[PDB]
């Protein structure tokens, strides 16, 4: 999945 | 961990591939991620432009952009940019995965294969086992260093490399393990070059020699580096001004994962 920022 | 002078773009690809004993290609699967590292806050309000080669709308790649990335701008202009036109990337130097892809090829298709493989077995006079030849051909531009071939037997008798018929004959047995099996390192496979790794090993029957796995890794740091499937950066640019270029380096890599013959 994806790293939040 | 590579050093970062402001902007560092890592294009990392992982190749799976499978062959029959005679070298007939069964399948392949290539996975990719474009990683962005920024450590100087001035450079973090930026947009990447992908190389003119790459087709971002080619669906066989399943190009997926991070949720914060403007998907439509990626598809129209090959531009990695943010939905929120005034937001920035982190300047904390952590690896942000912003684009991914995956591609597969079927039986007898070599388009995703960096290293083709064939094997031959006939029985031996020197040990209670088999004389093995593994034939390989790189189609890469760079050399592979320290390729490791693993044969899933743990013999009693130590393995004998045939120094005569192996192309890169400082080739050596690095370990022999009860679970992981027997690993042979060869130091170099040169760019676009066919070689061979000949040896003899103790095994109860032919099928115990399989699956044979290979392990390898190519890395290249350079603004104009192209990934194995053609991913590359054209430029990096101030989000607010596309003529104002920015300084950056690119690393491209290719490592194997499930890469085997059985």
Curated annotation (Swiss-Prot), chain A:
It is found in: Cytoplasm; Mitochondrion; Cytoplasm, Perinuclear region; Golgi apparatus. It comes from the Eukaryota. Present with 9560 molecules/cell in log phase SD medium. GTPase-activating protein (GAP) for ARF1 and ARF2. Involved in intracellular vesicular transport. Required for transport from the trans-Golgi network. Implicated in the regulation of retrograde transport from the Golgi to the ER and in actin cytoskeletal organization. May be involved in the maintenance of mitochondrial morphology, possibly through organizing the actin cytoskeleton in Saccharomyces. This is ADP-ribosylation factor GTPase-activating protein GCS1. The chain holds residues 348 to 352 of 352 of the full protein.
From Swiss-Prot, chain B:
The chain holds residues 285 to 546 of 546 of the full protein. It is found in: Cytoplasm; Golgi apparatus membrane; Cytoplasmic vesicle, COPI-coated vesicle membrane. Present with 18000 molecules/cell in log phase SD medium. Oligomeric complex that consists of at least the alpha, beta, beta', gamma, delta, epsilon and zeta subunits. Interacts with DSL1. Residues 4-262 form the MHD domain. Residues 1-156 are annotated as: Interaction with DSL1. This is Coatomer subunit delta. Belongs to the adaptor complexes medium subunit family. Delta-COP subfamily. It comes from Saccharomyces cerevisiae (strain ATCC 204508 / S288c). The coatomer is a cytosolic protein complex that binds to dilysine motifs and reversibly associates with Golgi non-clathrin-coated vesicles, which further mediate biosynthetic protein transport from the ER, via the Golgi up to the trans Golgi network. Coatomer complex is required for budding from Golgi membranes, and is essential for the retrograde Golgi-to-ER transport of dilysine-tagged proteins.
């Amino acid at each position: 999945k994806w790293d939040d920022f | 961990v590579p050093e970062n002078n402001g902007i560092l773009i890592s294009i990392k690809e992982v190749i799976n591939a499978e062959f029959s004993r005679d070298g007939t290609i069964h399948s392949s699967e290539l996975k990719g991620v474009l990683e962005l590292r920024i450590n100087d806050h001035d450079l973090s309000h930026s947009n990447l432009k992908l190389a003119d080669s790459i087709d971002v709308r080619d669906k066989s790649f399943q190009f997926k952009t991070h949720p914060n990335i403007d998907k439509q701008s990626f598809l129209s202009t090959k531009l990695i940019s943010l939905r929120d036109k005034s937001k920035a990337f982190p300047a904390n130097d952590q690896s942000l995965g912003v684009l991914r892809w995956r591609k597969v090829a079927p039986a007898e298709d070599d388009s995703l294969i960096p290293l083709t493989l064939t094997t031959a077995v006939s029985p031996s006079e020197s040990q209670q086992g088999f004389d093995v030849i593994i034939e390989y051909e790189s189609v890469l531009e760079t050399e592979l260093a320290d390729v490791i071939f693993t044969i899933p037997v743990f013999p009693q008798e130590p393995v004998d490399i045939n120094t005569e018929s192996s192309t890169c004959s400082d080739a050596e047995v690095v370990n022999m393990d009860q679970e992981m099996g027997t690993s042979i390192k060869i130091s170099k496979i040169a760019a676009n070059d066919a070689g061979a790794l000949a040896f003899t090993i103790e095994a109860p029957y032919e099928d115990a020699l399989y699956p044979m796995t290979v392990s390898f890794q190519e890395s290249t740091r350079d603004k104009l580096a192209k990934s194995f499937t053609g991913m590359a950066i054209q430029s990096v640019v101030m989000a607010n001004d596309h003529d104002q270029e920015l300084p950056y380096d690119v690393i491209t890599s290719l490592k194997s994962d499930e890469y085997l013959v059985q």
